Amino acid sequence: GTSKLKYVLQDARFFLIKSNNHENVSLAKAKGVWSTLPVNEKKLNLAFRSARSVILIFSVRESGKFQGFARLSSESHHGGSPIHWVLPAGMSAKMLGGVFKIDWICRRELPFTKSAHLTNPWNEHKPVKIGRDGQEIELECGTQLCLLFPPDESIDLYQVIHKM
Numbered sequence: 001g002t003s004k005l006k007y008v009l010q011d012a013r014f015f016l017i018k019s020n021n022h023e024n025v026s027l028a029k030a031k032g033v034w035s036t037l038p039v040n041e042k043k044l045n046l047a048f049r050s051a052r053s054v055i056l057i058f059s060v061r062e063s064g065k066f067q068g069f070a071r072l073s074s075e076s077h078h079g080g081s082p083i084h085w086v087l088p089a090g091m092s093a094k095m096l097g098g099v100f101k102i103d104w105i106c107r108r109e110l111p112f113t114k115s116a117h118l119t120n121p122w123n124e125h126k127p128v129k130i131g132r133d134g135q136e137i138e139l140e141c142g143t144q145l146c147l148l149f150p151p152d153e154s155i156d157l158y159q160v161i162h163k164m
């Protein structure tokens with residue numbers, strides 16, 4: 001069912017994560033970690049202290065889809081292992097040393113065609129698929145977007161609710 005999912009999303013904050021390639025999203029799903037640029041790392045750390053749940057919604061550039069969503073379980077921390085991110089052009093490894101731990105809520109895909117009816121007030125009411133890495137998604141839009149994803153029956157939200 002969706003009841004525990006709705007509970008997790010209650011009063012959550014949502015942020016759009018735009019990855020340049022699938023490999024980093026695959027690594028994030030396997031290891032439960034994410035890293036972003038310093039400007040967004042600061043935003044996520046502020047949000048983590050401010051909200052009962054902080055939700056990252058992932059989209060690989062040019063894929064035309066979202067690849068799932070996850071809840072921050074910690075602030076960023078350095079010096080814990082060297083994550084073998086595939087680094088885009090202009091992207092060095094020192095701009096990813098901040099590692100957040102995340103718990104996946106859904107690892108299923110959602111095509112952009114299914115979210116065309118949702119606009120984000122914090123990005124000029126453009127379709128929620130549109131936005132830069134780190135763009136915040138307003139509560140109602142973010143909640144409805146997460147509820148569009150196919151259910152991920154491999155995930156038990158009981159442990160996530162306890163992290164809260």
Ligand SMILES: CNc1nc(Cl)nc2c1ncn2Cc1ccc(CO)cc1
Pocket residue numbers: 018019020021024034035036037085086087088089090091092096133
């Ligand atoms: C592990 N995390 C990430 N993995 C990937 Cl492949 N792209 C990301 C990630 N975070 C943000 N972006 C988009 C971006 C923004 C700025 C530059 C600077 O050249 C490169 C890429």
